[PDB]
Design a protein around this ligand. Structure first.
Ligand SMILES: [Mn+2]
Ligand SMILES: [Mn+2]
Lengths: 196, 56, 292, 293
């Protein structure tokens, strides 16, 4: 009942504070309503404040805000374009996979999973794939199964050449560890992609 | 048988505008030594044999 | 604003109250620009100044546009034969023609200390940065902070324009970590650290006045802790290695750090007490006592 | 054999996540599998960082789902529950059923301890037996749950420094070797080392003292310091008392009470909190409120 431009302009003096406050339900609603505003306020407003807002949401404490920001980033990369976020969002997300905390690493893995189906297959071959390949030697048992699930998800997206060249040996190497959860996840990924 | 340079190169929570993500440490964490007794199996019972022979 | 301050101080016959009020406002609003050691080298020493300028700038310094020096920096012939004399022949300028050369000097300081570089080139770069610190020092500090990056193939924080850098000066201490064994670049970073500490003090003093539209004790404690953390980082930089002790870059860097710590202790005698109450490893005890 | 059982476990978890209880045979098989699984665990479960330790749930499935939405999903991050998830709640069977399903499905990704309410004489006087009699008709699911509660471990050792346990310290116990040499396959008595381990409470008393609950003792700061210094520990996590902020520090940052049950008994209206411990043993207190129904 209200024009998109009007509601996006009226919520400008309030989004500078409601985006980061104590509660998270308001933040969840703001993240859910953002994709209807970032596409109308242009691109300069995005790289001005919305990029920082999303980068701050991606490292929030709770998990609901993190997954909401992940879905919002997916919607934004589907609405704006592919090559636009190749040098603005992808490097900043890939640079987060170096922290000693496993939560940020799991967040980056979830972002790689959600962006592998929108960013085609040419970028996810030499830009986002080497990170998932190198994050396999992580001694944290709660990151190896996430990496295996990410490989399973990006399996059908990537061609058979990449799945047979480097994905199969690293999966065979991952299937020979001592943990049981990561081993079952890797065996399921092998048996669903018909790679073994 | 039986300091701050590395904390500065990765600080500011990768944002330079907010506090740290955690709320501090409890003790030290990740005990360095974690050593296990793996000296030898052979030539250990012979020392016990020599000690028992001396005691006899 | 520093170039305007200088060009207003250069006109003392006319402009009676204008320059006076401008300096009285600069001394209060921008204390990080009123550092004595920043713009004291421009004083006359023996009259030898401008002599080499008037006697060694006629046959050259006419076809040395910044693009030539830029293309001479990055090239397959990384030999230091042409770039050395090029960067040396332009040291005779009046610190006002080096504004187009500042952009070429920056963004290449990190590439400078790659491997096997001479000593005179670093000294000339340090002298150029010092003579370019008398004019537009804020933009020069920003460019030098943005140039000395770890270069780890991943972008974490970039361009540090004016807010994320003046709030916490500690960013000037998380550089590529290769400049630690580099006396000229270390002195440049120490000058930038002192300037940014003063700028952060001024920024907090101005921010506590534009709020609530106690907090002063909190600001004082924050400033004291920030100075103590800076001193601790500078002390930990003085560590030899990660595993001659007199003739090496480590000695010169330790001496420069001791000089900066002496200046800080002279400026504020409380940060020394706070650091001593915090403590530091004993390997630095015979160095600070005999160096400060 | 294993894949079909895993898929059945995933289906059971997805059914429990929608306020839907299981059948008699399904609960029986789940309790049997949990009995064969928990038999290998000792009294002091060696938990490895990183983890996300919680507190009491007291049979609150909606609050448990809120906790899962706040502190990450169950298969993703590790969890350490310290008992009290069976009594004083409208949805009590669903909470313990989901917890035991996650335990039998993620035995290396989630750990649950035994509380004072996980017994046979407490569940009959707080409503859990009534809920099992009303929902399932008969009283066999309650019997299976009480027979399974005897297999739950007593305490947990996180990174060899943090000592998590429901009740707290004991006067008859001076080291963890005594706790490891206890027969946990026994009904919680009215007196002894296990009763004190499941019924203790911290205070500024100093020494010991009878607790107003009726079982267990009440230690002070000196006792906590002596227990932490004689066992190489640096912290003692517990969840037995009602707090407001969610987490409470006592005895010079030696005891941490973590109550993760928001709106306790639907009459206090307080908050709840969990403690997320990273790989470098860095703690973060994540707080939350009761989710609207
Ligand atoms: Mn309780
Ligand atoms: Mn209890």
């Amino acid at each position: 009942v209200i024009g998109i431009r009007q509601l996006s302009q009226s919520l400008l003096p309030a989004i500078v504070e409601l985006a980061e406050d104590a509660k998270w339900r308001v933040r969840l609603a703001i993240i859910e309503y953002m994709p209807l505003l970032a596409g109308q306020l242009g691109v300069e407003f995005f790289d001005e404040k919305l990029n920082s807002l999303c980068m701050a949401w991606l490292v929030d404490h709770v998990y609901a805000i993190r997954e909401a920001a992940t879905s919002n980033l997916k919607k934004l990369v589907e609405k704006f374009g592919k090559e636009w976020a190749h040098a603005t969002i992808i490097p900043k997300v890939l640079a987060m996979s170096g922290d000693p905390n496993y939560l940020h690493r799991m967040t980056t893995l979830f972002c790689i999973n959600v962006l592998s189906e929108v960013c085609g297959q040419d970028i996810t071959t030499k830009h986002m794939l080497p990170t998932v390949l190198r994050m396999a030697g992580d001694p944290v048992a709660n990151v190896r199964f996430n990496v295996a699930k990410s490989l399973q998800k990006i399996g059908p997206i990537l061609d058979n050449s990449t799945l047979q060249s480097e994905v199969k040996p690293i999966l065979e190497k991952l299937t020979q560890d001592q943990d049981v959860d990561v081993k079952y996840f890797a065996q399921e990924a092998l048996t669903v992609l018909s790679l073994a | 048988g039986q300091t701050n340079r590395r904390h500065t190169a990765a600080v500011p929570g990768p944002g330079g505008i907010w506090s740290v993500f955690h709320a501090g440490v409890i003790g030290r964490g990740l005990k360095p030594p974690k050593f296990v007794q793996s000296r030898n199996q052979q030539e250990v019972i012979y020392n016990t044999q020599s000690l028992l022979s001396l005691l006899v | 604003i520093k170039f305007l301050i200088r060009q207003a101080q250069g006109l003392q016959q006319e402009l009676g109250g204008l320059h006076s009020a401008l300096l009285r406002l600069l001394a209060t609003n921008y204390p990080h620009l009123c550092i004595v050691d920043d713009w004291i080298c421009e004083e006359e020493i023996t009259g030898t100044d401008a002599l080499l300028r008037r006697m060694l700038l006629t046959n050259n310094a006419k076809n040395h546009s910044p693009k030539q020096l830029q293309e001479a920096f990055s090239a397959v012939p990384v030999n230091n034969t042409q770039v050395m004399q090029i960067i040396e022949h332009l040291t005779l300028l009046s610190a006002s023609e080096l504004i187009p050369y500042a952009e070429v000097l920056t963004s290449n300081m990190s590439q400078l200390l790659n491997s096997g570089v001479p000593r005179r080139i670093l000294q000339t770069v340090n002298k150029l940065w010092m003579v370019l610190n008398t004019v537009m020092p804020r933009r020069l500090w920003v460019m030098t902070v943005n140039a000395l990056q770890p270069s780890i193939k991943f972008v974490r924080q970039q361009k540090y324009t004016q807010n994320d850098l003046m709030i916490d000066p500690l960013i000037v201490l998380r550089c590529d970590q290769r400049v630690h064994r580099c006396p000229p670049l270390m002195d440049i970073t120490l000058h930038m650290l002192n300037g940014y500490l003063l700028a952060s003090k001024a920024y907090l003093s101005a921010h506590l006045k534009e709020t609530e539209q106690t907090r002063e004790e909190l600001k004082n404690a924050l400033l004291a802790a920030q100075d103590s953390a800076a001193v601790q980082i500078l002390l930990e930089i003085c560590l030899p290695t990660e595993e001659d002790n007199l003739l090496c870059n480590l000695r010169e860097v330790q001496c420069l750090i001791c000089c900066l710590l002496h200046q800080m202790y002279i400026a504020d005698p409380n940060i020394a007490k706070l650091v001593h109450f915090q403590g530091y490893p004993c390997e630095l005890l015979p160095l600070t006592v005999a160096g400060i | 054999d294993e894949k079909v059982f895993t898929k059945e476990l995933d289906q059971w978890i997805e059914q429990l996540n929608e306020c839907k209880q299981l059948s008699e045979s399904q609960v029986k098989s789940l309790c049997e599998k949990a009995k064969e699984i928990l038999t290998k665990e000792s009294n002091v479960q060696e938990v490895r960082c990183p983890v996300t330790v919680c507190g009491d749930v007291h049979g609150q499935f909606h609050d448990l789902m809120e906790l899962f939405r706040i502190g990450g999903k169950s298969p993703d991050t590790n969890y350490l529950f310290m008992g009290d998830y069976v009594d004083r709640g409208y949805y009590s069977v669903e909470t313990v059923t989901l917890l035991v399903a996650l335990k039998v499905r993620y035995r290396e990704r989630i750990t649950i301890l035994r509380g004072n309410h996980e017994s046979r004489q407490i569940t009959q006087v707080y409503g859990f037996y009534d809920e099992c009699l009303r929902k399932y008709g008969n009283a066999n699911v309650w019997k299976y749950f009480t027979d399974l509660f005897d297999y739950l471990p007593l305490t947990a050792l996180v990174d060899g420094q943090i000592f998590c346990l429901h009740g707290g310290l004991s006067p008859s116990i001076d080291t963890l070797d005594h706790i490891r040499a206890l027969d946990r396959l026994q009904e919680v008595p009215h007196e002894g080392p296990m009763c004190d381990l499941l019924w203790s409470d911290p205070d500024d008393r100093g020494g010991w003292g009878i607790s107003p609950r009726g079982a267990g003792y009440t230690f002070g700061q000196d006792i906590s310091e002596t227990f932490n210094h004689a066992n190489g520990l640096t912290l003692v996590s517990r969840a037995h008392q009602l707090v407001m902020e969610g987490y409470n520090w006592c005895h010079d940052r030696n005891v941490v009470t973590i109550f993760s049950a928001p709106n306790y008994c639907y009459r206090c209206g307080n908050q709840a909190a969990i403690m997320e411990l990273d790989d470098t043993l860095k703690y973060s207190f994540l707080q939350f409120d009761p989710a609207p129904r």
